[PDB]
Design a protein around this ligand. Structure first.
Ligand SMILES: Nc1ncnc2c1ncn2[C@@H]1O[C@H](COP(=O)(O)OP(=O)(O)O)[C@@H](O)[C@H]1O
Ligand SMILES: Nc1ccc(Oc2c(Cl)cccc2Cl)nc1
Ligand SMILES: [Mg+2]
Ligand SMILES: [Mg+2]
Length: 265
């Protein structure tokens, strides 16, 4: 069906490990979208073909206002192309770099939108496993959309692929290579809530080896300006034992969230 000839390519939107993402326009309809380009030789070398297939299959069948759409894919003997919904306001990562920290109202609102999206995912027993600011995109009204389903799966699970980059958002059961489930995304939700209010993630460190130590021991502390409501929520999410982490309805109904979020559930 689709081929490269059907599109006019424009400015680079971002880079990922394999991904190289461009603004693009389809010729007949003038429809604006994003084209995520992957090199076959790099996919083969890294052995991550199965991850790419999962990304396409999982993300294409989901339909939620806070989840980025994937429309289709094609390929041409050097490259694979994913056709994505274009997010015009960029990444949460970029916004955090601009502002250093978010206020309580911005944070609670982002957390509500995240929890909504994740509730829809978990209702299909889909877990994302790579929630972090570079994978959260902003639509035209400034609303948050989860993206980058390359690491997503169905639960329960072990891990089959090597851990590539940052440990900063992963829970203990994941970094210790044990069995995991839905609750991994709740831990990441706690890391995010902290990073939004403080400007850095709670277990950050100079080396892999010590970051590992701080995560498995759950060693984090709060600066003075973090209020009591935020501390209560974050402390509940960042529990070593997964089963003690709250349900998503409990997050969406937490008093600090309901007091500060400017969106409903
Ligand atoms: N649909 C999109 N709209 C706008 N920018 C995007 C879009 N998709 C990706 N980007 C930009 O490109 C980056 C990498 O895309 P991503 O799908 O996360 O690739 P990877 O799997 O390599 O991490 C994102 O962090 C973002 O900066
Ligand atoms: N269903 C599906 C979705 C994506 C996909 O990517 C490719 C392609 Cl086109 C070629 C080689 C390897 C991979 Cl992983 N192949 C099938
Ligand atoms: Mg990414
Ligand atoms: Mg990826």
């Amino acid at each position: 069906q689709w081929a490269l000839e059907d599109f006019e390519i424009g400015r680079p939107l971002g880079k990922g490990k394999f991904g190289n993402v461009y603004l693009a326009r389809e010729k007949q309809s003038k429809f604006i979208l994003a084209l995520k380009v992957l090199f076959k030789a790099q996919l083969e070398k890294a052995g991550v073909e199965h991850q790419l297939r999962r990304e396409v299959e999982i993300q294409s069948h989901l339909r939620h206002p806070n989840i980025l759409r994937l429309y289709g894919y094609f390929h041409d003997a050097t490259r694979v192309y994913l056709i994505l919904e274009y997010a015009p306001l960029g990444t949460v990562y970029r916004e955090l770099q601009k502002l250093s920290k978010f206020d309580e109202q911005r944070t609670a609102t982002y957390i509500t939108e995240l929890a909504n999206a994740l509730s829809y995912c978990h209702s299909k027993r889909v877990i994302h496993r790579d929630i972090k600011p570079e994978n959260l995109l902003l639509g035209s009204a400034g609303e948050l959309k989860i993206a980058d389903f390359g690491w997503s799966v169905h639960a329960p699970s072990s891990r089959r692929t090597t851990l590539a980059g940052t440990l900063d958002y992963l829970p203990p059961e994941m970094i210790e290579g044990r069995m995991h489930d839905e609750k991994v995304d709740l831990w990441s939700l706690g890391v995010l809530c902290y990073e939004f209010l403080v400007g850095k993630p709670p277990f950050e460190a100079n080396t892999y080896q010590e970051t590992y130590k701080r995560i498995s021991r759950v060693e984090f502390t709060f600066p003075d300006f973090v209020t009591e409501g935020a501390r209560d929520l974050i402390s509940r999410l960042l529990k070593h034992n997964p089963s003690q982490r709250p349900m998503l309805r409990e997050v969406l109904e937490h008093p600090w969230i309901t007091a500060n979020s400017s969106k409903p559930s």
